[model samples]
Structure formats: structure tokens, C-alpha cells
Target: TVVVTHGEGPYIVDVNGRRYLDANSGLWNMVAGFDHKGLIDAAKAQYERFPGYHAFFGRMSDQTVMLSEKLVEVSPFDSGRVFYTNSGSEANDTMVKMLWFLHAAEGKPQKRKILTRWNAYASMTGKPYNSVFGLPLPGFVHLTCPHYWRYGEEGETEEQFVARLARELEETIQREGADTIAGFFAEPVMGAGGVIPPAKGYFQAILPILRKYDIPVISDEVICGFGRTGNTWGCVTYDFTPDAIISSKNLTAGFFPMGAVILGPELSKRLETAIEAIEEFPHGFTASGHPVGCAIALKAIDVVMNEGLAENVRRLAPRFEERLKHIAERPNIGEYRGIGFMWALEAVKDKASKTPFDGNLSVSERIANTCTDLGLICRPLGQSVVLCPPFILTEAQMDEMFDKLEKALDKVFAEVAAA
Candidate 1:
């Protein structure tokens, strides 16, 4: 495991007394960095006021109500409802349960399958390196990542790429039989699955297919929420306009655990009816809507807005992209793709063919280790190295991160070439 002892702004201090610029932003969370006073105070104050309140058994805390109301007000959708959990994975699992409940209420219990993109990170179980897991769940199906460098056909343009992906999605739905499909899960810009942003017209091409099948879309914003994508939500960043949105990570500025599942008006009405019929929802975590977590989340929202983190992200994204693009042009680099703060550098054995390094080589892991040694924290997935700094980082810190990353890349390349 990667180790760190202290964090100051964009830099992380290792146990051995070395400091490295934290380009990954504590696994793409920690938007406000390590020591945001606002978040800390909120948590402390909440603990002193109401330390043991839960949003279960028909009981709710004032902090919980305030946080839910704030989320509803900030949500892009009209009159949204919020359900809280402790993490993004839990929120996603809850969304799946909610979708099933809604479909059952609609007299279509058979529609329990979830369709997700091939490279999406909404999956909470198993790593891509282990294919034994075989797609995680029995009813889950994966389409494809919309990156032209990897999934794009030999001669396909951006428009053709999107069309092809849309066609594949439709074919999958038809093959699975629309009657058993419940919803589609997607990331506005894929995070751990190689940071591949959508191709041109990607959402425009796919939304109609989902509508035709009457499949609701769940936008997983675990990595893209709270100004990380230069907007309040990744749905706006990518023009998804999903039926529901899952948000976490920066919800409490990573100080207190909190996640939320937000529903559009149509979904909300169905859920409300389902709850009414049951007289109680059949699911929720014990830690769901903890009073302290809710208080921290309220303050985190203020920090994100008052600091203008979204605008800061928009301004620095181009510089981050340019650095990654320059690295991508190197002989061993395959593709560099991202939007806002998140980006990935894909390594290749043959630049012209865009062929990834042999799995036995473990190039991604080596680069990740190299970066760690140099004081930067980054992780590799498959053959891609993901990098996403906190939204509050300064431009100087961004440049330092890339500079250290470049050094790490060079070292990894030399070692791999020797191997």
C-alpha cells in the first residue's frame, strides 16, 4: 500500500520524512485538502451537539434534514430527493436496490439488470486485472469505453465512434431483452477506468437508445462531483441529463464520510409510492445519514462554493491536459484523455498501433511505485496511470506535480526497457 503521514495543501508527507506533491488528491477525493478548518469545525460541533442520531426507524436529525434540503436545492434536477450513505459504493448499491424497488412497483420485477460501460468505475468489487470475477454481478452487462485510442475501430471518426458505441449499447439491450434491463449506470468522465472522457456526441447518441428501452440512467458522480469537473455535477460537464445522480467523495471534503443518491421527480414519485405501500423502506445502512456526517457535508458545500473551486478547476484543467498530452506524445505513451481535473496517461508497447504493454510486464504498477517513491501518490489501473489533483491546488502546485510525475515516468520507462 502507498504510505503517507501528513498532507499540506497539494503535498503529502511520507512516514520517512519526505514530501511529494499529491497529484491524485487522496483517491480523487479531498477537494478541500487535508486541513480545511470549516469541515473540521463542522464535524467537531456536530459530535458535541448530536453525536448519535440516525436517519432510520422514522427518526431523523436536524443536521440530516438540513443536509438533504441543501442537496435538493443544489441539484440540477427539479424537486429532487436525497438518500444518504457512507460511501460511493454504498450509494451505488442503494441505487441498484431503489431501481429494483421502482421497477417492481411498476409491475416489472423482471427488470433487475443494470447496464454499465465497459471501463466504468461504478463497480465496487474486483479489479480489471482479475477477470475471474467475470463482470461482478449476474445481471450486469458492460458496453465499451468511448475512447478512440483504445476502443475506437481502426478508421472510425469521433461521430462514427459514438454511433458505434450507441449501436453496441442497443444491441446489448436487445440481446439482454429489454424486459429484464432495469437501468444504465455511467460516469460522466470515467475515473479509475482510465479517465477516458466521452467522445463527440457520445451522450447525444446513447440517450435515445436508453429512452427507447425505457431504461433509467444513473450518473455515478463519485469522482466527478463538487466542482471536480468544473461544474456542480458531471452530468452538466458531459451533458448527460440522467434520471438519477450518485455523489460522494467530496461531499464532506473527505473529512467525514457521506454519500447521496438523488432522484428526479418521476423517480421520486415512484419511490415515494413504493415506500408508502411498504410503510417503510426495506434498506439502509446503520451509518446512513449520521448527524456528524451531515453537518460536515453542509460545511463542505460552503467551502466548495465560497472558495470558487469550480472556476479554479476550469482554469487549471487546460494546463493539466496540456502536460498529459505532452507526456502522451512520448514514444511509450499511447493516449492522454481527460476533462476538468481528472486525467489518465495510457502506456503502450507500440505507439503507432496503440498496443498496451504486456500484462506480465506490469508497467502500470511499476510506474505507480516509481511515482510513490518520488513522493507523488498515483495508482494504475490496467495499463493506465490516473492523475487528479485537488480542486483547491494552486497553479504552481499543479506544475510541480507534473514535473515529479515526468521524472517518475522516465525512471519507469528505463526500468521497463531493461526488463
Candidate 2:
């Protein structure tokens, strides 16, 4: 791995003083970039005012409360509540635990299962194995992936794929008994699963089924939460209203390490009533709503909302799509898929059969490493190269990135094909 020292808008300087375009945006977080002045100023001001504090024992910095209001204000939910954590994993884990607690407290002890896609972001931080997708918890079930390009059967249409997926979901509920299910977990688009957006009618088909079963769904927005998908929330972009939202990363625009579970109005009321009846909810993190993190998040969110950063994502999306689609059109790529700033190019060994490169060859890694040599950074996910550049990347910088990536692709594809 290359070790770096400092960074500018959408690029970083390594310790050896070599500059590279940060195409992956520091694992897709640094949307505001490495050194955004507004975020830096916010962090500094919060540090000066109240350097540190815990959210436990009824003690919270004033900025924490203010951040809470901002979270609620920007959320699509009407009259919701927000709880904080230090990372996305925690936010998701907390959401699961809260659903269980809420259900059990409301006298539905059997409501504990969480249904989700087999392709998902990291699940939890506990046990180090939490990153394993579709882990079979006794109460949790993973459904089929919604990626039409890869998962759809050869003869299936996109709408047919959605129907099959929805059918499977309904069947699972019937087989396991819906009364035993607590809620379902989903990402608007499966971020780690090759940057896949849902197939056509994917959510619209299953959402009603979820509602019919009275199963609350939680949208894991760890990656798609902010303007990453050219929207305030992934659910908004995808046309679904989740009962709860697990958000992080872009929530703070990569300015701080933070995450949260936003409860919609319906669930918020249930949670409050349950906590009130029990006399205490009795759950949280010590640094759950750290003053400085909240302060930075406040400004970071303001930058995305009022400052036209979200608009920029929309503005440059066409060029982004143009280049990405061009890459997809290349003979060596099986598919190019994604929306907004997130995208992936699947490496294929053959055109006719749509055969992927042998897993052992690690074609994606080779391409990514080659790109690194050419002074660009992208991510290798399975057999696909992923790119989700910082939202602040300029049009010229974007062209620069694709040009470098194209060179790397040519080099690697030629090398692999010849061998």
C-alpha cells in the first residue's frame, strides 16, 4: 500500500511526493475532499468552544443538539428522531437492536428477523466477521441481489427479475412466518456489491409486500446517504420511504467519522412510547454524539445542501456517465454500472460468453494497481474496478481521471489478453 502525507481537492500527495487523483475518494468517504476549509473551520471552532464531551448520562454538548435538529431537518421523514454512532457499522447494528427492543417492548417477542439482500455493505463491526454479507443470523435472512446485469437470468427481463425477487421475498416471509420477522434491511443501491443500483421496479415491487407483512424496512445509506447518488438520501433517489435510515460517511461529507439511525415518524412514536413505559431506553455510545464530530457534520451537511454541492453532482453526472459508459462499451469490460458518482467496470475475459476473468488472476486488482502507477486511485471489488470520486472533483479533473484510467485499462487488458 502507498503511504501518503497530504491532499488537495480531489488528489493526494504520497510520502514519495507523487501526486495521484483520488478516484475512490478515500474508500468513498471524502466527498468534501481532504482539506475542505469549511469543515476544517468547523472542527477548529468546535474544538475551541468545547474540545470534547460524552453523550452519556444526560450530558451532551450544545452542538450535539443542534446537529440533531439539522439531521432531522434534512431527512425526508416527517417528524423523526436521530441517534448517533461513530461509524456506519454501529449505526446499522444499533438500528437492528432498536427494532428488536421496540418490538419486544411492544409485546411482539417473535418479531426479530431482519431480511436483506445477499449483496450488502458491511453488516456490523463486532466480531470482525461482521463484514461478511448475508450472514445467517437466526432472526435475519438475506434475499437475492437486485443487480439485473449480473443476477438476472439469461432470458429474464428487468421487470421479470423484479417480480421473481419479490416473489422470493413473499415466499420467505410465508415460509418463516411474517410474525417472526422484525424488519428488513436494505441499501438503496448495493454499494459494495459492484456499485449496483436497484433494477427497474425493484423497490416498487417489494415495498408493498414489505408493508403488507407489516415489516419495517431500514435503508442502509452508509454510502448513498448524502449527495453521492445525486440526492439527499438513497431512498429519495430510488423512490421508497423507509421506516428507518442507517446513514454515515457522506452524512458528515467525510469531514468526521460518524453515523446515525434516523427513525421515521411512525417508528419514532413507538420508540418514544416504549422508552417512556420502560422508564429508560438504556442504550448508546460514550462518543455517540461527540461535540466536534457533530459540529463538523453540521457544516459538512450545509455544504452539501445549501452550497450547491449536491447540484454539482447532478451537473457533472452526464460527463461521468459518458466516460463510464464508454468504458463499459470497451471489449474487455462485461458491464459498467452505477449512478451519480459511484460506478464500476466489470472485467471480462471474453465478449461472446460474457466470461469474467479468473478469480485467481485478480484482473481488477491488476488494473487498479496499474492505474496507481499511472497516478490515479480506484478500488478493486471482486472482479470489478470501482470509482466514486470526491463530489468536489472539477470537470477537468474528471477528464484527467478517465484519461489515466483508460490508459491503465488498455495496458492491463493488453497484458492479460496476450498472456
Candidate 3:
């Protein structure tokens, strides 16, 4: 294990004094790099002032209120509301509970089902590993991910691929009884599920069907929010508006473990009405809106959107794409897929046949391990090599990243080729 010590910009130093370029964005959240002065100063100032507090019993720090206001102001919704949680998964749980509460309050207690993509699992295992935990719990419905590159039928056009997915959504809704389903959640670009971007026109095709059934759409923006995908929200990059957004990760630039449920006008109004009926939401964590977290988030938003960080992503993205596209020209590289700073290079043994390397070989893992030895930290997701560098990464750093990655890829490919 690398004893990851101090972080300097996009690089982390090991105990052995080896510095590795962090192309995984510290698990896809540390967008402002590890040593942004503004975020650090904001946290220090808040710690000096209020230190800590929760959003309970109608008492919260001023920083919490300010963060809510700032989030709404920057959100795609003309007006909205925000709820705080500890992490992205928690934020998603909060949103689901909110939906259930909203529907139950309106006297439709049966609308407890949640709709979300199964893309994360579809790429590899047929049966979800959640079976080990007796999960998928009861009412959560898994829908097909619109990954046209992998799932598209033989001779199918992109338009047809999207239409087929749209049909699947409608059919799923009908089979499950639309009235029983609470909402459909999606990530604009699937992150840990191998950095998959949605197929073209995917959202535009399915949003109308969900609207037709009156199903709420929740965007899980934990990985794609705050300029990661060249936009403030992935929903915006995909050109769709979700009823509510589950955000974390870059919300505080990974400076803190915090998540938020930012509700659009419709959901906000419904939630307000529902809360008025119950006198309180009756759900929240002790550290729901910690003052320091809010303060850091406030500064993080400014640093990512107003400062040069966002602009850097926009400026550097084309070069990132071009370099990776060039790397994909290798015989073993099947595809270079992503948007903005987030991208993945998928490995295949036979390019035309799209055949993957033997599972026992762990080709992607070998490439990433080789990358680490070369002083670069990348991720191996399924058979793809994922690279999502911090927004502060410069052109020189980008070159270094690709140079090291290319060397590792060549080394591993040669090994597998000979085998």
C-alpha cells in the first residue's frame, strides 16, 4: 500500500517520496486539487467562528443558510430548496425518502418504488452482487442503461438504440404499474460503472415518457457535478432538468464529506406542502449542515465556477480528448469514451470482434498497477482505464499523464500479446 502523505496540487506524495499524478480525482471529487488556498482559508475561518452545528430543531449555523441560498442560485431551477446529508449515497437515500414522504402524504402510499439504471452491473456481472446482502431491498427497480456502444443491437442505428431504450423505460413503467413507482434516477455519465456517457439523444427520448407517467426524475450528480463534465450539472450537459438532484463529491471539492439534495420547483413545492402537513420532515443527520462544510462548499463553488478552475476544464478538455483518442488508435484499445475531463480507455483483445482479455489476466489491473509504478495513479474499472484529473491540472501535467499511461499500456499489451 502506498502511504499517501501530502497532496501538492494534483499529485500525492508517498512515504517513499514518490509523487503520483492523481488522474482519478481522488475518487472523482477533488476537482480543485488538494491544496486550494481559498477552500482551506474558508474552512479555517469557519472553524474559528462556529466550528460545528446541525440542521435540527430549526437551529443551524448561518453558513448553512448561505450555502442553501448559494446552491439554489447556481442550480438550474429558477427556484429550489436544498437538504444536507453526509455523502452521495446518503443524499440519494434522502431524495428517495423525500419522494416516499411526498407520495405518502398525498395519500398514495403505494408509490414507494424507485427506478434507476443497472448499468453499473450490466457491464460485467449478470446478477448483482447485492444478492449477498439480501438487497435490491424490495421496491427498487433496475432499468437498462443506455450504453449504445456496448448494448446496441447488431446493425442498429444510434437513433434506433435510443428509441429501444425509451421503449424499455415505458414498458418497465407499464409492467410495474406507473402509479406504484415513485421516481426514476440516473447519472448523466455513469462513473464507477466504467465512465460511460449516455448515448446521443438518450435523455431527450426518455424524459417525455417519465413525464407522461408523472414519474419524478432524480439526477445523481455526485460524480458529474461542479464542472466535471464541462458544466455545473450533468443534467445541463445532457440538456435535461431533473425534479431533484443528488449532489456530493465536488460539492465541497472533496474538502469535506457532505452531500445535498437540491430539489427543483415542483419537488420543492410538494415537499413544502408535505412538511406543512407533518409539521416536520423528521429525518436528518446530526452533522446535516456542518458550518465548516457549508463554508468550504461556498468557497468551493466560487473556486470551481467563478475562478479559473472551470475555465481550465473547458480549455484543457479538447486536448485531453485528442490525446486519448490518439491513444485509442492502439490495436488493443477498443474505445476512448467520456466528456470534458472524465474519460476512459477500454481494452479489448480483438478490436473488430470486441473480445475482451481473459478475466484471469486482469489486463486493466495490470495497466493501472504499471501506471502506479510509473508514478501515476489511475483506476481500472472492468476492462477500462479511467482518468479524471483534477480541474487544476495543466497542459504539462496532462502530457505527463498520457506519457506514463501510454508506457503502461504498451507494457501490459505486449505482455498479453505474447501470452
Candidate 4:
């Protein structure tokens, strides 16, 4: 419902015939943008070859099998196995169920609780939906995002900030009793949590603690996966060796709905035993592994590789970052944080003290609307305006994007200053 119409390479048409540069990348998906001929043709061909085929009951579709294999090959973890789903939320819910099943099968039923970083996108709304629909069961806990700009103490060095967070995580585990913890979920780059990139030494410090408790890590790559962070996988981008990776958004380049929950060797073994004990995992959607969707995803991966989109992201990231930091110097700007194609610009009422504008003013939304009026589509996240353009954005387009953003900021500041 949020979308009206879409086009190729960074433009979308609204119902009123207004065309805007889609800097948010269609809820941060649509990496290939709209009107990708190759992806569309691939989907059409698969639809013609097989109108619909199910991957359940040991029945295999050629396209589905091929996509699964391709995903495992490109995954960050070693010797991966993939389970298909329809959306990122479904994939995460499935992961929760599998993790719980694994612990139960291992005779550690107490290890049923799942801990995820506070802003890690752990299916807060979707978990309840699953319960109502009688799909997979759910169990999860939340923790704070290890972002210095938001959570760091006054005068805290980056290393000290990370150390403090690592200690907090350790304390949480101890309070919960390590045996009660099953796994930890994280986003390699905090996506919807205001595009806050990992603090220096954050993951490096946290992973060892998880290892000490033998807690599996589920890297939620729903937003950061597939070159969004300038790497093959977000796990690779942030140097995370996860027990599993949850991916969706760019799997089919937004041409079709598809998702994947990829399990590493050890986790796969536990899942295998869980399936045996349960006599079959009662998890899967009607459209899970749809052949057409799978075929389209395969083509999407091809586009990402053939076009060297990840390399392009790497090249453009610094330019974008530099411009963003420059924008952060504005009187109304508080902090700018992100990596690669993703970024967030936080607005403040007072520059020196970093005092945010009152929530009633909705300063972030005001700036986002101003940008929209300037013919660009960015999003408001709390007090920050988030930007995430498609990978195919040219340097000129990047300049245009930032220019509109600067103008919008100026307009908002003038209005606020006058008031």
C-alpha cells in the first residue's frame, strides 16, 4: 500500500504522477531497482515452465534446488544448508522455532530463551502473528543496540564504549543463567535501528563471550544482506562468523517474495536431529520456495555478481560517508552514522549540547517531507532521516541525492530558527 508505482534505477511514480528518487530503496530492498529486464524475464520463463511447484514432501523443483545450492555457496558461514520461506519475518520465526527444537532435542530444554540485540529486528510483531496463525512457536529476549551515538556514555572512547556493552551482555547472560540462553541475534549493520554501524571492536568483543556460553549467533541480514553493505554478505562485511544467517530483501531483487534461513554445519546437525525427533518440521509457507521466485532470485544473484554491485558500493561508500559527515556539521544535525549505501542523519535543536527537538515537532519527519518535496524519498527514523539509495546509483546521482538533502535540512532549519 505504501508504493504506487516503480521504475528503473532510483525513481518511483506516485499515484498523482509525481516521480521521486527512491533513496530508501523500497523499504531498503529493491537493490536492482525496478524494471530489471533480466530479472523479469527469468521470472516469466520460470512461470511458463512450471506454473507452481511445492518444495515440501521431498518434492523438488529444479529452480528451488539450484537457488538453495547457490545461496550455500555464497554464504559467509562454512558448509551451509538453507531453508526457504516467504519473508524475512517468517524466516526469523522459523529460526526461533528451530533453535528451540535443537535445544530440546539436545536434552537442554532450559535453553529455550533467545536473546537478540534490542534493535536487531527480531520479529516483535511477526512472532505474535505466527502464534495467532498457529505456525511456528516463538521465544525471544531483547538487548540494547551497541551504538555509541545512542547508547554510549559521556566522553566514552569507541573502544571503551564497546567494552562497556560487551560487559553488559556478559552480565545479562549471567543474570539469566547461561544454561537458559540458547542463541543471540544481531544485525551486522544495525539496519532499521537508525542505520547505526557497529562500534569499533563491538562484535569482536561480543562473539567471544557468546562462545564462552556456547550460545549460537543468528546474524539477521534481512536488510544488510546481498551487497547492501558492500560485501557478498553482511556477516562478511562486519567479520561475523555466525551459526546462521537470515536473509531476504534482495534475494529476488524485490521482483518476487522470497527468503532464506541458512544454517552452518553444527546448527544443521542439531536441526537434523530435531526434525527426526519431531518426525518432520511443521514449518513452511504455501509459497515457500516457489519455483518462479527461486528462479528470479538466482537471476538477481547473477546481476549482483555480473554487475559487480558490491564493488560499486565499496567505491561509492566513502563519497557518501564524507558527504553525510559534512551534512552532520549543520546546526540542526546531531549525529550521522552508517556504512556503505546506508546512513542516518540525526537532527538536534541545540548543536553544542546535542539536545533533540521535541518529539511533538517530529523534526525528522519534517526534514524527510522537505526532501520528498524536493523529489527524493527518504525515511524518518525517530529524530534521524535515513538514506539508502540503490547500488546502481551513479556519482552524479549521489551528488543530487545529497544536494536535495542539504536543501531540505536548510529549509527545516530556517523554519525552526524563525519559530
- TM-score (all chains, Cα) for each model: 0.92, 0.94, 0.95, 0.91
Each model's lDDT comes to 0.81, 0.85, 0.88, 0.82
Best by TM-score: 3
Pairs in clash, predicted candidate 3: none
Score candidate 2 by lDDT.
0.85
Cα RMSD (angstroms) for every candidate in the order listed: 3.6, 3.8, 2.5, 4.4
- In order, how many clashes per candidate? 0, 1, 0, 1
Stretches of candidate 1 above 4 Å error? 1-3, 52-59, 119-129, 132-135, 277-280, 285-288
Better of 1 and 2 by lDDT: 2
Model 2, residue 52: what's the lDDT?
50
CA displacement after TM-score superposition, residue 66 of candidate 1 (Å) = 1.2
Q: Rank the candidates by TM-score, best first.
A: 3, 2, 1, 4
Query: In model 2, which range of ten residues has the least summed lDDT?
Result: 119-128
In model 3, the worst 10-residue window by lDDT is 128-137
Off by over 4 Å in 4: 1-3, 55-58, 119-139, 277-288
lDDT of 2 by residue, 102-203 (tens): 888888888998897754334645455646654545667778988887778888899899999999999999998988899998889888777888898888
lDDT of 1 by residue, 1-419 (tens): 64678788777777777887777788788887876676777778776776555334656777788988888788788687888788888898889988888888777899999998653323466566766443445588878878777777888788888888888998998899999998999888877677878887888899988998789998999988888878889888777688898988988878877789988888888888887876766566332477788888888888887777778899888888887878887899888878888888888888997777888899989898888777777879888888888888898888778887899889889888898
- Model 3, CA-based lDDT: 0.88
For model 2, how many clashes? 1
